[model samples]
Target chain A: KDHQLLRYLLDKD
Target chain B: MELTPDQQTLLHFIMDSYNKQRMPQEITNKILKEAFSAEENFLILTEMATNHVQVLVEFTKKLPGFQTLDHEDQIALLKGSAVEAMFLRSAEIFNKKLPSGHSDLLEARIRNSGISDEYITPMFSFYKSIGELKMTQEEYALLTAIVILSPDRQYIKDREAVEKLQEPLLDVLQKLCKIHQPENPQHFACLLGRLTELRTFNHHHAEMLMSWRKFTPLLCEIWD
Candidate 1:
C-alpha cells in the first residue's frame, strides 16, 4: 500500500 | 588567451557600439553610463565564465563520491549544483548579448514573484552570502584581469572537483529543508521526497540560468 501510494504521488508529476 | 589584434580591436568596437546604442533609454541609461565609466562588462563575463568552470569542476569531483553522503545530503547537493550550473550557463548567454537592463529585469521579476517576501529574502541573502564566501576582492580582480587579457584557460579542474562542488550544494539543500518546513511543511515534504524530480523538470522544461524565464512566469501566474 505504501509502495502504491508512493508510486501514485510520484506519477502525479 | 588567443586572439588576433584585429579581433581584440573589434571586440572593443562592439563594446563601444552597445554603449552608444542604449545610452538614450531612460531605464538603461544609468547602467550604460556605469558600463562606460567602469569598462567592466568584459571583465564580469570573464569572471562569470571562470566561476562556471570552477563549479563544473567541483561537481565532477563530487558526483562519484555521492554515495558517501546520507540521502538528505545527496538531494541537497543535487539541487544546489543543478541550480548553480544553470545560473552559470545563463550568465554565459547574458554575457554574449550584453543587454543593458537584463539584470534589472531579473531583479524586478524576482521581487514581483508571488512567493512570500520573507521566503524570497532568504534566497537573495543566500546568494549574497555565497558571493562573499566564494569570491574575494583579489579573485574578482583576477576575473577582471582575465577579461582584459583573455586567457586560453579560464576553468579549473581537480581530481575531486565534482565532489567538492557537491558539498556546498548539499549544505544548501539541508538548509532549504529546514527553511521550507515550518512555513509550508507539505510543500516542503513534497520537495524533499521528489527533489530529483524538481531538478529533472528544471533541466528539461525550465531555463535554469535566466531568472526571467525560469522564475518570472511562475511569479506572474501565482500572484495574478
Candidate 2:
C-alpha cells in the first residue's frame, strides 16, 4: 500500500 | 560539475512550492476571456516551461546524490519524471474555490475547455484534495524530486544505476515528510498519494492540451 501511493500506475504489489 | 549541453533543461525547474510557477490570476473574468492562450498562450506556456526548467536546475543542484549521478542517469531522471513533476507543481492552476467551499481550478478549467465534465469531476476532486494537504517546502521539494527520480519510468538504460539513485531519495523524502509533520502521522503516505493522483492529472492535462493544439501553435510546438 505504501509503494502504491506514488506508483499506482504500476501493476506491482 | 559544469553545465553540459546534453543536460535536460526541464530538470532545472525547482523551489517555488505551491506557487504555480508564476501563473497569475487574471484580475477580471470580466473580459470576453474566450481562451487561455488566445492572445499569447503559446508564449505563456513556453515561458512557464522555462520557469519549470529553471526551478528544476535550482533544486537538483542542491541534492548531493543528484549531482553525483552520471550525467546519463541525471538526464534519465529529468526526462522520465519532469513532466509529472511540473504538472504537480503547477496544479494550483486548477485552484478555484468550489461550491463545497473546497477548491478546484482544474474542474473550472475543464468546464471552460469544453471537454465535458463527466470524466473529470471525480478525478479533479481527488487531485484537489491532495492539493489541500499542509505540506512544507522541504517536503514538497523532496517529493517532487522523487517523482523525477523514479526507476520505473521507461527508457532507462541502466536500471540498477537509476534505482540506486532513487532509493536514497525515497528514504530522505520519507524521513523529512514524517519529521516535518508529526501532527499528521499519515503525512508521508499523504504525500505519496498525491503523486499517484498527479500521474492521472498529468495524463488528463496532456490530452486536453493535445486537443487544444488545434487552437494554437504554442501547444503544438512546445507541448508536442
Candidate 3:
C-alpha cells in the first residue's frame, strides 16, 4: 500500500 | 501533457476563463440590484457566451475535420453545445476550495443577484461534487471539446459527419480517463453523466433568468 501511494506521488510537483 | 494537437487547442482555449466580480456582502439590495444589471450576473453570463464562441472558433480552426464541414454544420454544433461548454468551463474553473475549506465566494456573488437560497444551495452542491473529482486541465479540455462536438443536437444538418468527428475525441478522452483514473473505475461514466446534469442545469438556469425577465442586450441575444 505504501509503495503504491509513493509511486503515484513520486513526481509530485 | 500527452494531449494531441486538437486537445491542446481546446485546452488553450479554456485558459481564458471569465473573471466575475466578487461583491461584498454588506452592500444594500439596491447596490446589489444595480451591480446585477451591468456588472455581476449580466457580465458573468455574457462573458460565458463570448468565451464559448471564442474558444469553439479557436478549437474548430485547429480541428480541420470540423472546418471541412459546411458552415451551417459548424454553426449547428456550436449552438447545440454552447451551454454544455459553458457549464463545463464553469465546473472546471470554479471547482476548488479555499484555505478555510468552504465554498468559494464568487458563486455567492452570482447568487446574490436575486437567486434565492433554493437555487443557490444546489448550485454550490453541484460544484462541490465536481470539485471532488479533481480532474486535470487536460481532462477538462478534452471533455469540453467532446461536449462541444455532440452530434445529437436537435438541428444539425449533417449528423453523421458530426458523429464521425467526435469519434477520435471520444477515443482520446477515454484513453486518458482510463490511464488517469483507473482507481475510480467509474470516472469516465461519471464525467459523461455530468453532461446530463448540465442539461438539467440549463433548464433550471433558463427558468432562473426568466424569473428576472430582464437581460442585457448581448445576453438577450443568447437567452432569446
The candidate maximizing lDDT is: 3
In terms of lDDT, the poorest run of 10 residues in model 2 chain B is B1-10
What is every candidate's alpha-carbon RMSD to the true fold? 18.9, 10.9, 12.6
Across all models, the iRMS values in order are: 12.7, 12.2, 19.6
For each candidate, give its TM-score against the true structure.
0.25, 0.60, 0.70
Across A1-13, the per-residue lDDT of candidate 2 in tens digits comes to: 1222122212123
Best-first order by lDDT: 3, 2, 1
Q: Residues B89-138, candidate 3: write the lDDT tens digits.
A: 65654663122322234455566655667666766677777787777766
Q: Residue B29 of candidate 2: its Cα lDDT? A: 31
Q: Candidates 1 and 3: which is better by DockQ?
A: 1
Q: Score the docking of each candidate (DockQ).
A: 0.02, 0.02, 0.01
**Candidate 3 CAPRI classification by DockQ:** incorrect
Q: After superposing candidate 1 on the true structure, give the runs of residues whose Cα lies further than 4 Å from its correct spot.
A: A1-13, B1-62, B66-100, B133-224
Better of 2 and 3 by DockQ: 2
Q: For residues B1-224, what per-residue lDDT tens digits would candidate 2 score against the true structure?
A: 22233222222333433243343344123122435532443334445554665555445545545656665555556655656776666554334322222223233434454453644574568656856885565556667767876777665667776677667656666655555666777877877788787677556756767555326543233233
Which numbered prediction scores highest in TM-score against the true structure?
Answer: 3
As for lDDT, the candidate ahead, 1 or 3, is: 3
